[PDB]
Amino acid sequence: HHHHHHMVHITLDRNTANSWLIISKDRRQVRMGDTHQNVSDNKERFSNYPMVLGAQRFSSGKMYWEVDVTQKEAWDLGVCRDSVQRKGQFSLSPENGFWTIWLWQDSYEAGTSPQTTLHIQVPPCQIGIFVDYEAGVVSFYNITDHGSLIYTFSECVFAGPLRPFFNVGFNYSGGNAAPLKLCPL
């Protein structure tokens, strides 16, 4: 790809975070805490899963950012509608307002309904996310493998403003404590 030059500075929105998440001072890293993080509840917080949104809202143009996933066992990344459900159980799908990929149990999958198997030869340590609002495209790139394409959602029906979307995953195994980190431009 050659999408780096639509690079945007993403920061995480504390107010949307699940109450067990710990967001760094610079709002560029997030990890799972070992307990509730002593915050009040609010209607924006994802209740059931270790999810958080970016602060930025996009309704036009081309946007690109990169996320470090080094030594994690489980995570979800992509974009979602500003109006996605926050409370209770739900699946990650375009019908529910999400355009995501994930790692789970040694397999990478795209969040279609039902999910799509991804074919990645070089396990990624950093993921690039490209959104073309006007074209209705969300694409995922393997920065560890010279920027190779992972997956493209096309004909997307955004139906509203978009926000960067993150899930650090649970840490039942003790092997998934590592943070998600927004990489420098």
Ligand X SMILES: Cc1nc2[nH]c(C(C)C)cc(=O)n2n1
Shortest distance, position 12 Cβ to ligand X, whole Å = 17
Binding-site member from 166, 169, 171, 176 for ligand X (CB under 6 A) = 169
DSSP strand pairing (98-104 vs 107-110): antiparallel
Shortest distance, position 21 Cβ to ligand X, whole Å = 12
Q: Which is nearer to ligand X, 94 or 143 (by Cβ)? A: 94
Which of these ranges, 13-21, 150-158, 162-170, 176-184, lies near ligand X under the rule CB under 6 A? Answer: 162-170
Neighbouring residues of 84: CB distance < 8 A, sequence distance ≥ 6: 96, 97, 98
Shortest distance, position 151 Cβ to ligand X, whole Å = 17
CA–chain centroid gap for 72, Å, is 14
Binding-site member from 25, 34, 35, 41 for ligand X (CB under 6 A) = 41
| SS (HEC) of 51-97 | EEEECCCECCCEEEEEEECCCCCCEEEEEEECCCCCCCCCCCCHHHC
Task: Count each helix (H run) and each strand (E run) in the chain, helices first.
Answer: 0, 13
CA–chain centroid gap for 88, Å, is 19
At 18, which amino acid appears? N
Binding-site member from 25, 34, 36, 88 for ligand X (CB under 6 A) = 88
Told to check if 111 binds ligand X by CB under 6 A, we report no
Binding-site member from 19, 49, 56, 115 for ligand X (CB under 6 A) = 49
For residue 130, list its beta bridge partners: 64, 139
Binding-site member from 142, 167, 171, 176 for ligand X (CB under 6 A) = 167
Shortest distance, position 133 Cβ to ligand X, whole Å = 24
User: Which residues of the chain form contacts with ligand X (CB under 6 A)?
Assistant: 41-43, 47, 49, 87-88, 90-92, 167, 169-170
